[PDB]
Amino acid sequence: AMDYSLVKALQTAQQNFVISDPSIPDNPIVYASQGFLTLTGYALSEVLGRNCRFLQGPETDPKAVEKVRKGLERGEDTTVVLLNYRKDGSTFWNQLFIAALRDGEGNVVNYLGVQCKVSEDYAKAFLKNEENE
Ligand SMILES: Cc1cc2nc3c(=O)[nH]c(=O)nc-3n(C[C@H](O)[C@H](O)[C@H](O)COP(=O)(O)O)c2cc1C
């Protein structure tokens, strides 16, 4: 990974994460941790140069996808819970944490996304609580 100290910190905990490069059209993945590859069932060669939206499918809530899109557009750290699909078509609940990695002038150089698999019970409680705003 472009070796930011926070990326090295996530590697020591064997977290699931990807790094995107917004200078490339459609803000594709340029790095994916072994944890992300094992969670999703994809080989690194199948993920590099693609936008992470390939994990979405028919049971994914498009309103959770829209929260991510608007968060990035507004330059905000974003946390959502949404249903994602593995390569084999099995589904899981993904608590997704996205941050901009910025230079000294505040320009976004990369996005960092951490995926945490959560239970259906946890996802329902998170989404119910989100809806009380
Ligand atoms: C670093 C990064 C990691 C992401 N990881 C995921 C993910 O694991 N699952 C997912 O459904 N979307 C993920 N996304 C969201 C999509 O890439 C995309 O931003 C989202 O679908 C909204 O844009 P769209 O309306 O063009 O689809 C991630 C985005 C970024 C920038």
From TrEMBL:
A cellular-component GO term for this protein: nucleus
Residues annotated for Mg(2+) binding in this entry: 45, 48
Record-annotated PAS domain positions: 3-75
Metal-binding as UniProt keyword: yes
Positions of FMN binding: 51-53, 56, 69, 84, 94, 115
Keyword annotations: Chromophore, Coiled coil, Flavoprotein, FMN, Metal-binding, Nucleotide-binding
Keyword presence, RNA-binding: no
Superkingdom classification of source: Eukaryota
Protein name: Aureochrome1-like protein
Entire-sequence positions represented here: 181 to 311 of 312
